[PDB]
Amino acid sequence: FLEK
Amino acid sequence: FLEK
Amino acid sequence: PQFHLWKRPVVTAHIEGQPVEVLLDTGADDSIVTGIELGPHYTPKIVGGIGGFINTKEYKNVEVEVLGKRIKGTIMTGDTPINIFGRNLLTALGMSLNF
Amino acid sequence: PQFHLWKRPVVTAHIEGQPVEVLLDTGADDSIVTGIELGPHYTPKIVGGIGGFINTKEYKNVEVEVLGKRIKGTIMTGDTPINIFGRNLLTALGMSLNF
């Protein structure tokens, strides 16, 4: 999980 | 990315 | 059937009868869920991600119903911002990344 | 062709001529790479993951050769422990999650  |  | 990845690949799962929205994630080795209670029979763990690491509780042989099938597997619980099903369960669901 | 997920879905990519090992990750919104140098024309960003968040540099219209195709897209660089290609590039490679 990666988000900006 | 997830790991132990 | 398949997921075309213009949106987040998200499904509803039942963990020991409880319903949860989960993200299907090929870059996760393992699965981690929050807001579900699963017992005192756990082992302590720490998982690392992008911004650092967290403490988890590892539960084995948990009952999971998802995509019209019922499987048993390892789930961790901890303070994840989103719930993840990692490769350990995606293999058990017969999923592949296709191109 | 497809990736059966018993092992990490990893491929080699060329970013502006430089070769890099990357993980194909459906739970990532975006892509982030380290150890590659890409220019002074970037915007500052912060991406959040599992253990917290990091500072990145966002570069647009970067040239990427992977899986016998050449595409242009957005790449961030920062202090990631592994390099990730997120959904933004996996859609451009015509990938789906199949079951």
Q: What is d(CA D35, CA D25) in angstroms, rounded to the nearest whole number?
A: 19
Q: What is d(CA D87, CA D31) in angstroms, rounded to the nearest whole number?
A: 8
CATH of the domain at D27: 2.40.70.10
The answer to whether the beta carbons of residues C26 and D25 sit under 8 Å apart is yes
Q: Which residue has the tokens 């990091």?
A: D54
The neighbour count for residue C38, using CB atoms within 10 Å, is 16
Q: What is d(CA C48, CA C52) in angstroms, rounded to the nearest whole number?
A: 6
Q: Is C25 assigned a catalytic role?
A: yes
Which residues does D6 contact at the CB level (< 8 Å), separation at least 6? C87, C91
Interchain pair C28, B4: CB under 8 A: no
Q: SS3 of C64, please?
A: strand
Tokens of C64: 């999971």
Q: What is the CA radius of gyration of chain D?
A: 13
Size of interface A-D (CB pairs under 8 A): 27
C-alpha D53: how far from its chain's center? 17
3-state DSSP percent of chain C in helix, strand and coil, to 5? 5, 55, 40
Give one DSSP letter per residue of C11-44, joined into a string: EEEEETTEEEEEEE-TTBSS-EE-S----S--EE
The Cα of D56 is separated from the nearest Cα of chain A by a number of Å equal to: 10
Give the Cα-Cα-Cα angle D68, D65, C99 (nearest 5 degrees): 45
The Cα of B2 is separated from the nearest Cα of chain C by a number of Å equal to: 5
Q: Of D9, D74, C26, give the one whose Cα is nearest residue B1.
A: C26
Q: What is d(CA D95, CA D2) in angstroms, rounded to the nearest whole number?
A: 9
Report the number of distinct structural domains present in chain D.
Answer: 1
Interchain pair A3, D50: CB under 8 A: no
Half-sphere exposure of C47 (CA within 13 A, CB side): 26
Q: Which residue has the tokens 């539960």?
A: C59
Please list the residues that pair with C85 across neighbouring strands: C24
Ramachandran area for residue C91 (φ above 0: left; ψ -120 to 50: alpha; else beta): alpha
The boundaries of the domain holding residue D10 are 1-99
Which experimental technique did the depositors report for determining this structure?
Answer: X-ray
In units of Å, what resolution does this entry have?
Answer: 2.2
The Cα of D53 is separated from the nearest Cα of chain A by a number of Å equal to: 9
The answer to whether the beta carbons of residues C65 and C11 sit under 8 Å apart is no
Q: What is the CA radius of gyration of chain A?
A: 4
Q: Does C11 reach chain D within 8 Å, measured CB to CB?
A: no
Please list the residues that pair with C70 across neighbouring strands: C65
Q: What is d(CA C42, CA D28) in angstroms, rounded to the nearest whole number?
A: 29
Distances (CA, A) of D20 to C45, C73, C83, D17, D39: 31, 34, 29, 10, 17
Q: Which residues of C touch B3 (CB under 8 A)?
A: 28-30, 47-49
